Design a protein around this ligand. Structure first.
Ligand SMILES: OC[C@H]1O[C@H](O)[C@@H](O)[C@@H](O)[C@@H]1O
Length: 281
């Protein structure tokens, strides 16, 4: 990162996962932007730090920046069981980590507020961000989804998500939310949870690109299909939000936008003033 940036790397114990979770962190205010990674999340650095100047862009913004590290194919959710076939030796509990363990550690050690924050996700974690806002409104009054999979329980989505998770580290969607008919699928479906976002008055920022090249993952899915379905589902989400009385959203579907880190970063920059005004202001 740019010289002079007070960027830290932390080891935050997760009791629920029985291991330490690495977290990249920049201070600068009591409230924070949680920057969530995609399907191919690595164990060294969060994709936002690898691919974008996020820390530099939010330096001296009055907001802290939190980039959890790890959780390949996790959907930032609490799984039913260890991923069956790839030999995972514990159960992912990333919702517990993000909503309890991590904010408790950051509050106790640094004074970061557990409440009044923003969740910003892309691709895999676009839906995660909205789900976090749906069920933890005090923690996340603001959520952004950038090229997110916003109707994971519908139609071919469980199949596509299963394919993409397998293509990213051999993870099993069935171990995560059960068979596609299990209640966990709808529970974690932003489209289904729109009325929670409306009643919570969540400030939502929803971007979606189209075409190629793509950083969505799921490269094992026939060319162009995931990229187009992601757009169509985002458009349906947009229409449904309005139909359900939603009145606190920004929807950015620029025709030249792609599902790629450069556009996701452009959106992160574009929403900065928006987050500042909503969270601080
Ligand atoms: O996400 C934050 C959670 O953990 C914090 O430690 C609690 O103080 C509370 O603010 C919340 O239950």
């Amino acid at each position: 990162s740019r010289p002079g940036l007070p960027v830290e790397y932390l080891q935050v114990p997760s009791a629920s996962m029985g291991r330490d979770i690495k977290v990249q962190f920049q201070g600068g205010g009591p409230h924070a932007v949680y920057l969530l990674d995609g399907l191919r999340a690595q164990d060294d650095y969060n994709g936002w730090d690898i691919n974008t100047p996020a820390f530099e862009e939010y330096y001296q913004s009055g907001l802290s920046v939190i980039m959890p590290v790890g959780g390949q194919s996790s959907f930032y959710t609490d799984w039913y069981q260890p991923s069956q076939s790839n030999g995972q030796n514990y159960t992912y509990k990333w919702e517990t980590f993000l909503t309890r363990e991590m904010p408790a550690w950051l509050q106790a050690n640094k004074g970061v507020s557990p409440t009044g924050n923003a969740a910003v996700g892309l691709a895999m974690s676009g839906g995660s961000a909205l789900i976090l806002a749906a069920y933890y409104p005090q923690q996340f009054p603001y959520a952004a989804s950038l090229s997110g999979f916003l109707n994971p329980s519908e139609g071919w989505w469980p199949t596509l998500i299963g394919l993409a998770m397998n293509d990213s580290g051999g993870y099993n969607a069935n171990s995560m939310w059960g068979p596609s008919s299990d209640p966990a699928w709808k529970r974690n479906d932003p489209m289904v949870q729109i009325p929670r976002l409306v009643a919570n008055n969540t400030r939502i920022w929803v971007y979606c690109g189209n075409g190629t090249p793509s950083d969505l993952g799921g490269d094992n899915i026939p060319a162009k299909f995931l990229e187009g379905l992601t757009l169509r589902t985002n458009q349906t989400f947009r229409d449904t939000y309005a139909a359900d009385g939603g009145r606190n959203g920004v929807f950015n579907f620029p025709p030249n936008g792609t599902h790629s880190w450069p556009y996701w970063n452009e959106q992160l920059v574009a929403m900065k003033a928006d987050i500042q005004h909503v969270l601080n202001g």
